[PDB]
Design an enzyme around this catalytic site. Structure first.
Site, PDB file in Angstrom:
ATOM      1  N   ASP A  36       0.798  -1.222   0.000  1.00  0.00           N
ATOM      2  CA  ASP A  36       0.000   0.000   0.000  1.00  0.00           C
ATOM      3  C   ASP A  36       0.843   1.291   0.000  1.00  0.00           C
ATOM      4  O   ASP A  36       1.317   1.699   1.047  1.00  0.00           O
ATOM      5  CB  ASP A  36      -0.928  -0.058   1.227  1.00  0.00           C
ATOM      6  CG  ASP A  36      -2.001   1.017   1.292  1.00  0.00           C
ATOM      7  OD1 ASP A  36      -2.118   1.815   0.322  1.00  0.00           O
ATOM      8  OD2 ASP A  36      -2.737   1.046   2.290  1.00  0.00           O
ATOM      9  N   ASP A 220      -1.544   5.638  -5.524  1.00  0.00           N
ATOM     10  CA  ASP A 220      -1.967   4.727  -4.468  1.00  0.00           C
ATOM     11  C   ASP A 220      -2.273   3.287  -4.904  1.00  0.00           C
ATOM     12  O   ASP A 220      -3.354   3.012  -5.439  1.00  0.00           O
ATOM     13  CB  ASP A 220      -3.159   5.349  -3.733  1.00  0.00           C
ATOM     14  CG  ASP A 220      -3.691   4.565  -2.542  1.00  0.00           C
ATOM     15  OD1 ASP A 220      -3.022   3.586  -2.119  1.00  0.00           O
ATOM     16  OD2 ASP A 220      -4.704   4.997  -1.961  1.00  0.00           O
TER      17      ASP A 220
HETATM   18  C1  LIG Z   1      -4.182   3.961   8.311  1.00  0.00           C
HETATM   19  O1  LIG Z   1      -5.280   3.028   8.245  1.00  0.00           O
HETATM   20  C2  LIG Z   1      -5.553   2.672   6.925  1.00  0.00           C
HETATM   21  C3  LIG Z   1      -6.565   3.323   6.240  1.00  0.00           C
HETATM   22  C4  LIG Z   1      -7.374   4.431   6.825  1.00  0.00           C
HETATM   23  C5  LIG Z   1      -6.854   2.948   4.941  1.00  0.00           C
HETATM   24  C6  LIG Z   1      -6.158   1.932   4.310  1.00  0.00           C
HETATM   25  C7  LIG Z   1      -6.500   1.529   2.886  1.00  0.00           C
HETATM   26  C8  LIG Z   1      -7.107   0.143   2.790  1.00  0.00           C
HETATM   27  C9  LIG Z   1      -7.618  -0.535   3.894  1.00  0.00           C
HETATM   28  C10 LIG Z   1      -8.185  -1.796   3.753  1.00  0.00           C
HETATM   29  C11 LIG Z   1      -8.276  -2.385   2.504  1.00  0.00           C
HETATM   30  C12 LIG Z   1      -7.809  -1.719   1.382  1.00  0.00           C
HETATM   31  C13 LIG Z   1      -7.942  -2.282   0.044  1.00  0.00           C
HETATM   32  C14 LIG Z   1      -9.118  -2.863  -0.410  1.00  0.00           C
HETATM   33  N1  LIG Z   1      -9.310  -3.323  -1.659  1.00  0.00           N
HETATM   34  C15 LIG Z   1      -8.259  -3.147  -2.474  1.00  0.00           C
HETATM   35  N2  LIG Z   1      -7.066  -2.611  -2.170  1.00  0.00           N
HETATM   36  C16 LIG Z   1      -6.936  -2.209  -0.899  1.00  0.00           C
HETATM   37  C17 LIG Z   1      -7.230  -0.465   1.546  1.00  0.00           C
HETATM   38  N3  LIG Z   1      -7.518   2.420   2.277  1.00  0.00           N
HETATM   39  C18 LIG Z   1      -6.889   3.036   1.336  1.00  0.00           C
HETATM   40  C19 LIG Z   1      -7.496   3.992   0.354  1.00  0.00           C
HETATM   41  C20 LIG Z   1      -5.477   2.599   1.238  1.00  0.00           C
HETATM   42  N4  LIG Z   1      -4.632   3.115   0.286  1.00  0.00           N
HETATM   43  N5  LIG Z   1      -5.257   1.684   2.116  1.00  0.00           N
HETATM   44  C21 LIG Z   1      -5.150   1.287   5.015  1.00  0.00           C
HETATM   45  C22 LIG Z   1      -4.854   1.633   6.316  1.00  0.00           C
HETATM   46  C23 LIG Z   1      -3.784   0.846   7.012  1.00  0.00           C
END
Ligand SMILES: COc1c(C)cc([C@@]2(c3cccc(-c4cncnc4)c3)N=C(C)C(N)=N2)cc1C
Length: 376
Positions: A36, A220
């Site tokens: 991520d 992203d």
């Molecule tokens: C800090 O806490 C967070 C948050 C708020 C969002 C995400 C997340 C996230 C969270 C859970 C699942 C996903 C996900 C789902 N489907 C496809 N790709 C990623 C993304 N959301 C976005 C926009 C991102 N770039 N990462 C990850 C974390 C660790």
């Protein structure tokens, strides 16, 4: 731990992110972790959940250190909470190193984990500025660079159908063709960039370039879609609808609420336009463009029950938090996150999208004389 050994180290399911294998603790506990670039925590599931095949078991790790600090992360459609600690971390098909890193052990969550994603945690690759609870929690990549000789750079080769590669500490030239074009990282928080121009089938959207970056534009890997600010999303949809006018789709398709289906192998790729995103170059009023085919923005939805057909979700959606160049944009491009030089490189990947008529591209340079600053 050479680049050849790092090739094909990613897996995933369409719309569910790309994951890499990692080990946490002593003896090592193997987990699949979402790559991520849109977050900065190393947050791992550490308690049973109906969607988790496995989880981090702190009690089983002799090297675990509790930081005596909780972390609470609410967001619009869900939340996660946990406990901060530190432990030994390795990437088996990544660099041949072991580092001590911060870990957010997720104890409770709502609509965070996904059914059948095959990942158990998230490797947040962005900067400390956006780490939770605050910027004092050193992100994984920062810890990796400080503790090893690993160059301050990583690259992602996301491939559609999923798989791909994450190369740490360098650029694998076997993963791209042509030239690598760089865009400056505007601010080190998210991987913030600037879009200077948007074209849909060679037709300029004719907006003030600040509209493209209202209130930021980011790269992203943790977002599936190309996310666009309202004004830009509306103009893009109008332009795509006009180019594809020989077929009419429901409003719900344009909103991401429904699938569009065609008989297997009959998808009319040609009625859909190409989208060109012009990114700010490394020199004044110079830019380059990345071209997106419908094979990228019409995301296939694999379903045995609809398998007489090829079904797709429109992978472009409205944002109220700025532009997001998600996984569908990154797919088919070799994306260099050159942290050391505060820039992001794009090149056509070995798994790029094309048909017999058109290809995804990275092209430049483009000059403008009548340019303002495109940033907010
Ligand atoms: C800090 O806490 C967070 C948050 C708020 C969002 C995400 C997340 C996230 C969270 C859970 C699942 C996903 C996900 C789902 N489907 C496809 N790709 C990623 C993304 N959301 C976005 C926009 C991102 N770039 N990462 C990850 C974390 C660790």
């Amino acid at each position: 731990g050479s680049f050849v050994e790092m090739v094909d180290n990613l897996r995933g399911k369409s719309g569910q992110g790309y994951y890499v294998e990692m080990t946490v603790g002593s003896p090592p506990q193997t987990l699949n972790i979402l790559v991520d670039t849109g977050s900065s925590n190393f947050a791992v599931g550490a308690a049973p959940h109906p969607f988790l095949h496995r989880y981090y078991q702190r009690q089983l790790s002799s090297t675990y250190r509790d930081l005596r600090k909780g972390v609470y992360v609410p967001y619009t459609q869900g939340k996660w909470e946990g406990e901060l600690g530190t432990d030994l971390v390795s990437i088996p098909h990544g660099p041949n190193v072991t580092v001590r890193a911060n870990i957010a052990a997720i104890t409770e969550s709502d609509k965070f984990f996904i059914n059948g994603s095959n990942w158990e945690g998230i490797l947040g690759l962005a900067y400390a500025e956006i780490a939770r609870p605050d910027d004092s929690l050193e992100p994984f990549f920062d810890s990796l660079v400080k503790q090893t000789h690993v160059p301050n750079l990583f690259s992602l080769q996301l491939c559609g159908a999923v798989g791909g590669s994450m190369i740490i500490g360098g650029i694998d030239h076997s993963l791209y063709t042509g030239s690598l074009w760089y865009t400056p990282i505007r601010r080190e928080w998210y991987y913030e960039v600037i879009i200077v121009r948007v074209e849909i089938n060679g037709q300029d959207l004719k907006m003030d370039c600040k509209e493209y970056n209202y209130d930021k534009s980011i790269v992203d890997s943790g977002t599936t879609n190309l996310r666009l600010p309202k004004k830009v999303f509306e103009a893009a949809v109008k332009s795509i609808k006009a180019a594809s006018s020989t077929e009419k789709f429901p409003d719900g398709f344009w909103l991401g609420e429904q699938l569009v289906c065609w008989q297997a192998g009959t998808t009319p790729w040609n009625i859909f336009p190409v989208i060109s995103l012009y990114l700010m170059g490394e020199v004044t009023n110079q830019s380059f463009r990345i071209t997106i085919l419908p094979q990228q923005y019409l995301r296939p939805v694999e379903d045995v029950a609809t398998s007489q057909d090829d079904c797709y979700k429109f992978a472009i959606s409205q944002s109220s938090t700025g532009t997001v160049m998600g996984a569908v944009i990154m797919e088919g491009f070799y994306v260099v996150f050159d942290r050391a030089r505060k820039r992001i490189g794009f090149a056509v990947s070995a798994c790029h999208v094309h048909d017999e008529f058109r290809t995804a591209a990275v092209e430049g340079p483009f000059v403008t004389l009548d340019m303002e600053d495109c940033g907010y």
